[PDB]
Design an enzyme around this catalytic site. Structure first.
Site, PDB file in Angstrom:
ATOM      1  N   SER A 261       0.818  -1.209   0.000  1.00  0.00           N
ATOM      2  CA  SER A 261       0.000   0.000   0.000  1.00  0.00           C
ATOM      3  C   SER A 261       0.867   1.282   0.000  1.00  0.00           C
ATOM      4  CB  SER A 261      -0.996  -0.049   1.147  1.00  0.00           C
ATOM      5  OG  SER A 261      -0.298   0.081   2.349  1.00  0.00           O
ATOM      6  N   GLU A 262       1.996   1.252   0.711  1.00  0.00           N
ATOM      7  CA  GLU A 262       2.978   2.320   0.539  1.00  0.00           C
ATOM      8  C   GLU A 262       4.378   1.767   0.702  1.00  0.00           C
ATOM      9  OE1 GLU A 262       0.125   3.050   2.445  1.00  0.00           O
ATOM     10  OE2 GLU A 262      -0.695   4.712   1.224  1.00  0.00           O
ATOM     11  N   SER A 263       5.322   2.430   0.042  1.00  0.00           N
ATOM     12  CA  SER A 263       6.753   2.279   0.317  1.00  0.00           C
ATOM     13  C   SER A 263       7.264   3.681   0.718  1.00  0.00           C
ATOM     14  CB  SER A 263       7.477   1.833  -0.961  1.00  0.00           C
ATOM     15  OG  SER A 263       7.224   0.439  -1.244  1.00  0.00           O
TER      16      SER A 263
END
Lengths: 278, 278
Positions: free
Chosen positions: A44-46
């Site tokens: 979903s995020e890095s």
């Protein structure tokens, strides 16, 4: 060429909470490359840890697989827990597109197990599409007013009269896709203890495990609507139905008209560690 | 507790092709845990390398974030390239739910840079929803017959009269979601060289980088429809429009009524390596 860790944010047990990949020493990566790596990881995020430019400890950039975000709760919490491994400082100041976010780190034997952040102060108004949203969710009415909060992302809150009713929800995800640039947060509970489910076609998630940026707005919503006081901490348990329990703690200090601090905290745990070839 | 590598399949350059996470020595992981790890990684597939049960070299289980798959092209290719690092053998026999797939590994200085697999022989028939599919894709007609192939997954092929026309496609993804348990593969080209784009709401991907299991069916489609011969290798370049170029080579031997071998091969490269805590 770059070391990374995978942190499950808002969990103390691997495979619970919400994963984020944190990439260290990222100054040599242009943002077009950061975006490509975030796409590659598909979490979903890095996030990418950069040298500070305004007196903080580090500058953090946050990417979904598709775009950069100016603020995100679970990715930032995970980043603070990851970076806390390479410092001894009690407090960690993380620069973001939207300013410097103060983190208090909690350790045991040098291991950061949890952190607390002071979030951006949200704004809010009535959603004004109640019958549409309720129909999509498959219920007749909310308990508390259906209001939409903005702190970067937008989060709408719909209250259910019991935890069982919350679990019984089976939303029409096609119908929900008509709600752009927001997430739908359904909640139930009493006193200190609340349960949530989040759905968001706009943000690319059918049902989210831990919506860090909705935790502060929920504590505001509950206090405004008389279910807790301003200054009282709440425990928000999300993602139980989908087998990804996530525990978020939140507190909104001050009063609706003059909020002083919106604190969100939680546990984080390392799921994995690695290196990438660029 | 487990080592893994991330392989970009159908690419020789990191960040191109289609990533798969390959987990080694997975015998101590129950399949419920394998599914949870695949969910955690969130890559289109994660695979798990197990001791063989029928005389092969290893048994491979393939998981999307949501379910187990009996066959997948790019995940298997990536697995063979990953595992090829821990053996000297020229050929690698990988047991899957659907049988043992023979891989020829290609090395340079001990590094596996490519592999070739013999795929399950597909079946096919007319889709019989041409006007619906064409409308969804936003074009009036296909060049070649719109046929749907089955080799595990199902892939429908719609031909465009030029590469430019292929790139100009802007499909109605909501309309495409009415096509269940299949992927929509649009193609264009001439002679040895073909271009493809794949879209699949059913398989959870807006546009795919490298649809390994569609490469064999495409070579069959082209030969059946007189654009290449049976036994002639084709080069299929996918994912250019979305910045994830993937090169798949395929060949269908025999004749439509009696296919002898469907060979698909390509390059693979390591993007990252790590360990997980369980």
């Amino acid at each position: 060429m770059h070391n990374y860790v995978i942190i499950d944010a808002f969990a103390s047990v691997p495979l619970e909470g919400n994963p984020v990949a944190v990439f260290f020493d990222a100054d040599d990566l242009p943002p077009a490359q950061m975006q490509r790596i975030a796409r590659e990881m598909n979490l979903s995020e890095s996030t990418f840890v950069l040298k500070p430019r305004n007196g903080g400890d580090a500058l953090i950039r946050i990417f979904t697989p598709v775009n950069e975000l100016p603020f995100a709760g679970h990715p930032l919490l995970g980043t603070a827990i990851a970076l806390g491994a390479h410092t001894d400082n009690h407090r960690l100041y993380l620069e973001t597109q939207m300013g410097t976010i103060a983190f208090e780190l909690e350790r045991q034997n040098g291991s950061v197990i949890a952190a607390s952040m002071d979030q951006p102060i949200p704004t809010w108004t009535a959603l004004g599409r109640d019958a549409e949203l309720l129909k999509a969710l498959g219920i007749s009415d909310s308990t508390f007013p259906i209001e939409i909060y903005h702190n970067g992302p937008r989060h709408v809150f719909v209250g259910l009269p019991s935890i069982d009713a919350l679990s019984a929800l089976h939303p029409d995800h096609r119908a929900l896709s008509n709600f752009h640039d927001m997430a739908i947060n359904c909640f139930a509970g009493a006193g200190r203890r609340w349960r949530s489910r989040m759905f968001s076609p706009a943000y690319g998630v059918v049902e989210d495990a831990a919506t860090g940026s909705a935790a502060g707005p929920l504590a505001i919503h509950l206090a405004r609507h008389g279910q807790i006081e301003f200054g009282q901490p709440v425990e928000i348990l999300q993602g139980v139905e989908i087998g990804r329990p996530s525990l978020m703690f939140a507190k909104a200090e001050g009063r609706a008209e003059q909020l002083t601090r919106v604190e969100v905290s939680g546990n984080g745990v390392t799921f994995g560690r690695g290196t990438i070839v660029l």
